[PDB]
């Protein structure tokens, strides 16, 4: 019951787990073999799963030029940077999948202990992305909302923000280099 | 079935190798199984450990004397 729960968190909802669009990564609660509070921890993970689903939707929608939404190289760069950060998350997910498949008895509690790091770096980025979408910033406006958040406190989140901001200021540097 | 036994033996050996590397015991792979399995015949663990320690001391003395 581990592999499909991982698939459902991989951006492809399962059957005992229902990725409600507005209800987030909900879970059809009718299966046996765990405590509901185990399902509650799984729901804490499903928070990140629904965040990943929404993030994928946003990244595909901001990876399409004539729409009135925020556009420019900035949006595509933000989507690309979020995807590249998810690369560490995707790699961790793949490693955890291999480990769980390798172990005859690899507890989902162990899966949680392995995914705690990504769950630690996840929510701050989700809040920042929701704020950026609400701001609908464009131009270097998002580049300064970033610079505001680039004084972050979450070490993984701080480093990821540093990398994304390096990519962004590289884009700004390229623009200024054309202007020079 | 015997392939399962071989795989289980390899897995146990790998687990033991990891346990030994973590213990930093300095015991060699030659005591892969021979060391443990011979004691598995019901040897006195304290006596066997003392014998292993004496063998280690004698081997260290022999290495020093050769050197």
């Amino acid at each position: 019951m581990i592999h499909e729960l991982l698939l459902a968190l991989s951006g492809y909802p399962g059957s005992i787990f229902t990725w409600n669009k507005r209800g987030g990564l909900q879970v059809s609660q009718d299966f046996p073999f765990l405590h509901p509070s185990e399902t509650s921890v799984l729901n804490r993970l499903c928070r990140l799963g629904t965040d990943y689903i929404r993030f994928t939707e946003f990244i595909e929608q901001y990876t399409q030029q004539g729409q009135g939404g925020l556009h420019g190289i900035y949006l595509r760069a933000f989507c690309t940077g979020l995807d590249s950060v998810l690369q560490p998350y995707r790699q961790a997910l793949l490693d955890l999948e291999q480990e769980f498949l390798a172990d005859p008895h690899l507890s989902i509690s162990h899966i949680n202990y392995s995914l705690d790091q990504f769950q630690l770096l996840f929510p701050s980025v989700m809040v920042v992305v929701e704020q950026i979408k609400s701001q609908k910033i464009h131009g270097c406006q998002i580049l300064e909302t970033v610079y505001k958040h680039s004084c972050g406190g979450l070490p993984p989140v701080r480093s990821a923000l540093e990398k994304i901001l390096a990519v962004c200021h590289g884009v700004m540097y390229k623009q200024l280099s054309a202007w020079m | 079935a015997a392939a399962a036994n071989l795989n289980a033996v390899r897995e146990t050996m790998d687990v033991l190798l990891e346990i030994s590397r973590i213990l930093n015991t300095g015991l060699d792979m030659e005591t892969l199984s021979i060391c443990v399995r011979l004691c598995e015949q019901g040897i006195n663990p304290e006596a066997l450990s003392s014998v292993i320690k004496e063998l280690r001391k004698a081997t260290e003395a022999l290495k020093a004397a050769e050197n």
């Binding site: 405590h35 008895h105 507890s107 989902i108 509690s109 809040v127 406190g153 | -």
Partner: protein
């Protein structure tokens, strides 16, 4: 129910998640077992003693989640939450080992024996938790240097790690202030206040 059934409920409880015939009571701010597993009060008391783990873990989750979402409560507060997250990750690794053991001997006594040390670590953490509310900025660093006034080499080392990690933000601010004279203090938490 079976003492093994209670063991499984405890295997859920250690994460703070109440069991089948074991429920997290609000009356005691702790785990009150669901009395529908009628059994001896000896085992009941064994779980009652273990309830502190659930109470403290839930308190830790609630308290760290509170300052985790507060961006302006202080990046120091967020850092304290992150260190608590690392500690809870270690605790969760222990709980995962426990659940794997729940899969497929041991004993509630052995569980309690093996759980005594995490109880001590959690006690140290909870003392640092309730003993740190409100102190932010230099007040926060004041509390960081203050709570380090106790012994317990184990707890002493844990608090030492926490404080050395806490020095890094203040250390960076001072390094900016001492290397560039730069004070970008948003919450005005630094010792050197700004007058722009």
């Amino acid at each position: 129910v079976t003492e093994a059934a209670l063991v499984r409920d405890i295997l859920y409880v250690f994460q703070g998640i109440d069991g089948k015939h074991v429920k997290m009571s609000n009356a005691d701010n702790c785990y009150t077992v669901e009395g529908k597993a009628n059994l001896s009060k000896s085992l009941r008391d064994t779980a009652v003693r273990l309830a502190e783990l659930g109470w403290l873990h839930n308190k830790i989750r609630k308290y760290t989640d509170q300052r985790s979402l507060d961006r302006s409560f202080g990046l120091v507060g967020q850092s304290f939450c992150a260190a608590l997250h690392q500690e809870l990750r270690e605790y969760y690794r222990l709980l995962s080992v426990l659940h794997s053991q729940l899969q497929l001997s041991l004993t509630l006594r052995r569980l309690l024996v093996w759980t005594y040390d995490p109880k001590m670590r959690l006690k140290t953490l909870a003392a640092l938790v309730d003993h740190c509310q409100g102190r932010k900025g230099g007040e926060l660093a004041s509390a960081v240097h203050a709570y380090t006034k106790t012994g317990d080499p184990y707890a002493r080392s844990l608090v030492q790690h926490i404080l050395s990690l806490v020095s890094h933000p203040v250390l960076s601010f001072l390094y900016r202030w001492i290397y560039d004279g730069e004070l970008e203090d948003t919450y005005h938490e630094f010792f050197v206040a700004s007058d722009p």
